[PDB]
């Protein structure tokens, strides 16, 4: 039945009222996974943030913190603008924790993962970025309490040799500048108040 | 004008064309041996020695023909995009190269091209020769490559003497300052101006002695047809 309701999401708006009634019934019944799928469908009909959050939660199979169903009970078309303060914090913290756990897993499997990503991001970055100070240690013990902990900073006067993994031809300086300008303009379309172009000006 | 480089080339041609140094007149040997023994240097060394004194074994007309063929082939090879890119990189990484005796990547490719050019010059000059095996130039040792590189000749270089004069403006001592103030001014001026100026002038001399002339320039000078 609910799967057919998914087609109603892709169909015309005549079944939306029936879809709203089905969503209300599901909220009353307190569905676990079908509620997530219906939330994804409804929040893909209007906006995308709540839908993708519900889909990501279903992918991690988040059984606990089932406040999304409470969000699914909101009368503003089975959703709500300016989402509940409980769900918003829950969604943000869940996203951040998933990212941190994935980073930890990848770093444990491949110790060079973070180093490779940082080097790739710093390869074409402006020189001032590459002179950023190194991260310090926040650990405790004899050091930082009785002794002294020396920093991890280095000279950071480095040369980046960028080689394509597949052997394809790399973009020249003019092509890289054109791509950078294109993306900066596209982001200016997204963000009217941003100083990204200033970074494009190389500090 | 007794231009230094041109007159040195003419002196070399005069010495080698006098007929006193024709290889047929000499039986090259290892003098240090207590028993008379032939020249036992490597085959690549012998070929490099023969190419170094190719003018001594040939008359003026044959030398001119062979050398003109070799130089025309070298020019047509230098017109290739790879050589142009190598020389562009050489002109690009000039200031940094002035700061250290360690060669960068922009110059090691140039040196590899120099080795290839030496091999190709030997192949071009002695093309019509039929008593040698150019296959010996296919895989060369490090020592053999160094031996062949010693005979490299960038014939697209300006053959005239590159020694020249430049004027670095001089700071006159100010009578209104003391000895110590004038000395500090002179030290600061020396470093901040003369050191970049002098280093850049000397590096420019080196690179101009290194970088060749584009073919059009030669035509504009009437040195190529």
């Amino acid at each position: 039945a609910l799967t057919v309701k998914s087609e109603a999401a892709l169909w015309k708006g005549a079944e939306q009222k029936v879809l709203s009634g089905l969503n209300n019934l599901a909220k009353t019944e307190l569905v676990q996974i079908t509620h997530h799928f219906g939330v994804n469908k409804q929040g893909s009909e209007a906006l995308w943030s709540q839908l993708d959050k519900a889909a990501v939660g279903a992918f991690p199979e988040l059984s606990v913190d089932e406040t999304l169903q409470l969000i699914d009970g909101f009368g503003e078309c089975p959703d709500s603008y300016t989402l509940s303060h409980d769900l918003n914090q829950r969604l943000l913290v869940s996203w951040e924790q998933l990212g941190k756990l994935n980073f930890q897993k990848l770093k444990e499997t491949n110790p060079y993962f973070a180093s490779d990503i940082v080097n790739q991001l710093d390869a074409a970055a402006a020189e001032f970025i590459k002179v950023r100070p190194a991260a310090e240690s926040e650990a405790g013990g004899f050091l930082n309490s009785l002794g002294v902990s020396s920093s991890f900073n280095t000279t950071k006067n480095d040369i980046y040799v960028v080689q394509s993994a597949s052997g394809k031809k790399l973009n020249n300086k003019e092509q890289r500048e054109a791509y950078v300008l294109e993306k900066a303009q596209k982001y200016l379309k997204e963000d009217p108040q941003s100083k990204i172009l200033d970074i494009i000006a190389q500090k | 004008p007794e231009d230094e480089g041109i007159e040195q080339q003419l002196d070399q041609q005069e010495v080698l064309l006098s007929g006193r140094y024709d290889p047929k007149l000499y039986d090259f040997q290892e003098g240090y041996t207590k028993n008379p023994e032939d020249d036992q240097t490597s085959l690549i060394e012998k070929k490099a020695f023969k190419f170094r004194y190719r003018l001594a074994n040939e008359t003026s007309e044959t030398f001119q023909r062979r050398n003109n063929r070799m130089v025309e082939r070298q020019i047509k090879r230098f017109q290739q995009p790879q050589y142009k890119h190598a020389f562009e990189q050489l002109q690009k990484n000039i200031a940094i190269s002035s700061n250290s005796g360690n060669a960068l990547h922009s110059e090691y490719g140039y040196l590899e091209l120099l080795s290839n050019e030496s091999v190709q010059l030997y192949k071009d000059y002695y093309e019509s020769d039929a008593e040698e095996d150019f296959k010996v130039f296919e895989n060369l040792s490090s020592k053999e490559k160094l031996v062949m590189i010693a005979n490299f000749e960038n014939n697209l270089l300006p053959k005239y003497d590159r020694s020249e004069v430049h004027l670095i403006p001089k700071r006159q001592w100010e009578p209104a300052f003391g000895v110590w103030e004038n000395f500090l001014y002179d030290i600061t001026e020396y470093a901040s101006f003369i050191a970049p100026r002098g280093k850049e002038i000397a590096a420019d001399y080196q690179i101009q002695s290194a970088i060749p002339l584009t073919k059009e320039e030669l035509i504009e000078a009437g040195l190529y047809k």
Partner: protein, 77 residues
Amino acid sequence: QTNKEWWNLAKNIQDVKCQQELNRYNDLLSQAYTLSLDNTIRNLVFKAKFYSWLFVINWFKAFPDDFHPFIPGLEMK
């Protein structure tokens, strides 16, 4: 005229084109001279005599590290 010990080390020495470079892998390839022998009284005395003779006769051979007839190089490989 090599042995199994030298060949096992020879395959793993890659990206070598000139004998000069292979000249820097001289003692590494000299491990093909294992000369496996016991440490009995006769062998230990024989080992001492043989190694002393090899040391003194390498003095009279007096070859540099570039010319090594007895250490196989790029030809065998």
